[PDB]
C-alpha cells in the first residue's frame, strides 16, 4: 500500500507579492542602489505554461511609489536624465518573464523563462506619446483590459522608433511625416482586426480640459515642454521633406507626476536646449456607433506608463516542500 | 543509445521534466534557496536586510517543519502514514513517469493542511512513546 513521502526542494511557485529592490549600474537620484550583475543569469523553462495579468500586476504600484519618492527627493533641492533601473528580487522569490511575441496582455504564455532580474528601464515622465521605451517585436501591439468598453484605455506599442526633436523662435518639436504616416497605417490596421473589416477610423485631437492632458507634457534637458499635438492626430482611414512642427509652450507652475494641489516655480537655466528622442508607443481613449470610431490621446495616470513596459514580468514565491504517495516503508 | 553523463538544467529547471527525473536534481535547488554570501538616506542597510530576515525566517520555519515530521536526513524520507485513495487517484506509472511536479501540486493543493495535520501528529506520537515501552528492559 502507498504511504506519504515528503520531498524538500520541489520546484513549485505561487502568486504572491513582496518588496523589490533597485539595481542600476555603478546622478539623478540613484546613489543608494545595489550594483548589477555583470552577467544576468536566465533559465528557460520548457514545458511550462501559466497565465499572466498585467492589469493586476503588483510590481507597477511599488515602482510607482518608489519613483514618486525618488523624484520628490530629486526636485526638492541635480540632473533629470532618466537612468535604466533594474528590479531585483530577494532570496526565495523568482521573477518570471514571458518571451513570446504574441501577447494580448492577459492569459496563458506558452514559453517562459526565469530571470534573476529585469532589463533596465528609464523612468520617463510623459503623457500621450511614449518616449524612450522598449519595443515589441513582430507587428504593432494593442493592449487593453476591455476592448469593447470605452471607459478603459488602449496601449499601443510600435515596431519602429519615431524620431522627434525637442528644440528651444518659439520652442517646437520636429517630427518626420512619412514614418509617422506608415506607423499609424500599421496602427490602424491592427485596430481594424479588433473592430471589423468595414470600419472607418478617425484620429482627432484631445477633447479638452487640463493643459497637461490636452498637450504632450514632457521633460527635455531639464526644461518643461507642453506641445499642442493637433498636427499629429488629424487623419481618417477608409472602411477598406515632409515634416511636422509641433508648437510648444513652457509654463512656470504646473501639475505633474500625479500630485494633488501642486505649484512649484522653475526658471530656464542657460543656453539653447535641443534633444532627440524616440516615440515607442501611444495611449488612446475610445469615444449611432456602428461605422465610425474616433480615438483620442490621453495619459495622465502614470501607472499606465509603467504598465506599458512591465507587462512581461511577474513575481512568484517558491514553496519548496511537497508530499507524494510512494511505496516505501521505514 | 550513446551517452556521456548528466546535464545541468539550472534554477527551477525541473518544472517541465518528469517527477522521477526531478527527484535526482533536488539538491542543486536546495543549495541556493538561502543562497548566502551576498556581501543621509538609508537604502541597502534598511529595507534590504528585511528581505534577508524574511528569507531566514522562511528557511528556518521550513527546516523546523521538516525536522518535526522527523527525518532530518532530508531531501527524501518515508513515513508510516497511509495514503488516502480519495486524493487524486492515479497509478504509479502515470504520476512518476509522465507528470511534472507543478501539475501534481495543481491537484494536491486542496489537501495541504489535511496532509500537514496527520504528518504533524500521527507518526511522532506513535513512533515515539513506544520506544518508551521498548526500552523497559
Amino acid at each position: 500500500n502507498l504511504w506519504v513521502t515528503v520531498y524538500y526542494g520541489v520546484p513549485v511557485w505561487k502568486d504572491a507579492e513582496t518588496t523589490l529592490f533597485c539595481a542600476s549600474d555603478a546622478v539623478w537620484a540613484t546613489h543608494a542602489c545595489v550594483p548589477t550583475d555583470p552577467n544576468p543569469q536566465e533559465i528557460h523553462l520548457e514545458n511550462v505554461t501559466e497565465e499572466f495579468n498585467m492589469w493586476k500586476n503588483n510590481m507597477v504600484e511599488q515602482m510607482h511609489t518608489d519613483i514618486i519618492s525618488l523624484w520628490d527627493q530629486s526636485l526638492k533641492p541635480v540632473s533629470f536624465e532618466p537612468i535604466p533601473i533594474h528590479y531585483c528580487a530577494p532570496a526565495g522569490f523568482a521573477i518570471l518573464k514571458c518571451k513570446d511575441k504574441k501577447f494580448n496582455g492577459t492569459g496563458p504564455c506558452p514559453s517562459v523563462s526565469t530571470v534573476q532580474c529585469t532589463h533596465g528601464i528609464k523612468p520617463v515622465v510623459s503623457t500621450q506619446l511614449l518616449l524612450n521605451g522598449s519595443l515589441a517585436e513582430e507587428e504593432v501591439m494593442i493592449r487593453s483590459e476591455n476592448i469593447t468598453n470605452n471607459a478603459k484605455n488602449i496601449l499601443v506599442q510600435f515596431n519602429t522608433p519615431v524620431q522627434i526633436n525637442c528644440t528651444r523662435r518659439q520652442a517646437h518639436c520636429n517630427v518626420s511625416k512619412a514614418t509617422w504616416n506608415e506607423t499609424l497605417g500599421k496602427v490602424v490596421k491592427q485596430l481594424r482586426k479588433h473592430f471589423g473589416n468595414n470600419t472607418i477610423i478617425r484620429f482627432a485631437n484631445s477633447s479638452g480640459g487640463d493643459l497637461e492632458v490636452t498637450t504632450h507634457s514632457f521633460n527635455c534637458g531639464g526644461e518643461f515642454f507642453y506641445c499642442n499635438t493637433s498636427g499629429l492626430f488629424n487623419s481618417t482611414w477608409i472602411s477598406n521633406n515632409d515634416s511636422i512642427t509641433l508648437p510648444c509652450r513652457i509654463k512656470q507652475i504646473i501639475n505633474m507626476w500625479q500630485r494633488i494641489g501642486q505649484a512649484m516655480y522653475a526658471p530656464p537655466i542657460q543656453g539653447v536646449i535641443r534633444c532627440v528622442s524616440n516615440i515607442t508607443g501611444l495611449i488612446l481613449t475610445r469615444d449611432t456607433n456602428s461605422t465610425t470610431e474616433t480615438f483620442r490621446p490621453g495619459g495622465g495616470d502614470m501607472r499606465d506608463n509603467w504598465r506599458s513596459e512591465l507587462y512581461k514580468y511577474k513575481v512568484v514565491k517558491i514553496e519548496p516542500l511537497g508530499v507524494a504517495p510512494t511505496r516505501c516503508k521505514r | 543509445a550513446v551517452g556521456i553523463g548528466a546535464v545541468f538544467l539550472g534554477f527551477l529547471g525541473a518544472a517541465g521534466s518528469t517527477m522521477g527525473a526531478a527527484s535526482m536534481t533536488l539538491t542543486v535547488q536546495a543549495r541556493n534557496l538561502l543562497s548566502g554570501i551576498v556581501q543621509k538616506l538609508t537604502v541597502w542597510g534598511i529595507k534590504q536586510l528585511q528581505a534577508r530576515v524574511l528569507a531566514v525566517e522562511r528557511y528556518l520555519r521550513d527546516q523546523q517543519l521538516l525536522g518535526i515530521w522527523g527525518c532530518s536526513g532530508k531531501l527524501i524520507c518515508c513515513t508510516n502514514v497511509p495514503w488516502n485513495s480519495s486524493w487524486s487517484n492515479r497509478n504509479l506509472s502515470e504520476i512518476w513517469d509522465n507528470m511534472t511536479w507543478l501539475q501534481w501540486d495543481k491537484e494536491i493543493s486542496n489537501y495541504t493542511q489535511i496532509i500537514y495535520g496527520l504528518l504533524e501528529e500521527s507518526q511522532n506520537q506513535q513512533e515515539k512513546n513506544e520506544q518508551d515501552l521498548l526500552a523497559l528492559d
Partner: antibody
Amino acid sequence: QEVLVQSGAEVKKPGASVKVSCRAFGYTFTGNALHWVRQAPGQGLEWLGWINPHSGDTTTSQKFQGRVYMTRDKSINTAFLDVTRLTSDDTGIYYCARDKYYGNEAVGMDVWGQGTSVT
Amino acid sequence: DIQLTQSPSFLSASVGDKVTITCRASQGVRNELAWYQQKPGKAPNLLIYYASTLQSGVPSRFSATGSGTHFTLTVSSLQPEDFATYFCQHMSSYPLTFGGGTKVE
C-alpha cells in the same frame, strides 16, 4: 528562439589549424549536449564529435581522434571547435547542432546553425 | 563501422504523390533512427526522431516506420516545398555516420 550562431567563413593554408565558434540563444546551454557535423561540397554530411557543455567531457570519432578538439565556455555560452593539421579534404561546411537529449542519450539534432565555410 | 544505404538515390515524382523511401542499416540498430530534410544552401531540419515520432512543427503528411535493419519514411501528399534531400541517422554506437541521401525532384 532556440538558435545557434557561429563565426564567419575562414580560408587557411594546409598544415595549420582553424578555430570555429558556436554560441547558443534561446535555451540553457548546459542542459543539452552538442554535436558537430561537416559537409563536403556536393557530398553527404560527416560527423566529428559531441561535447557535454556542463562537464566539458568530449567524445570524438576515431577517424578524427587527436586531430579535432572541442572546448566550451559557460560564461559566454560558446562551444569551440579546433581542427589541426589541415589538408584539402576538410574544405566544406561545419555545423554545430543541439541534440534533443531525452533520457541521458542521443535522440536527434533539432536545432542547427547556418554553417561555416572552411576552405 | 556502421553502413547506411538509402534507396533510391534519385526519385522523380509529381505534386501530390505518395512516396515511400527506404533506409537500410548493416546491423540491427533497434528503433533509434532520425530523419532529416535539407534544402541546398540551408541547414538540415529534423523531421523524425525515434524513427516513428513526429517532431513538433513538422506537419502530419510526413511519417516514418521501421525497426531493426529496415526503415521507411512516407509522405502522403507531396507539396512543392517538400522537394529536398532526406537523411537517416543512427546513434546506437560509435561512430555516428550519415546516409547516402535521397533527392526528390
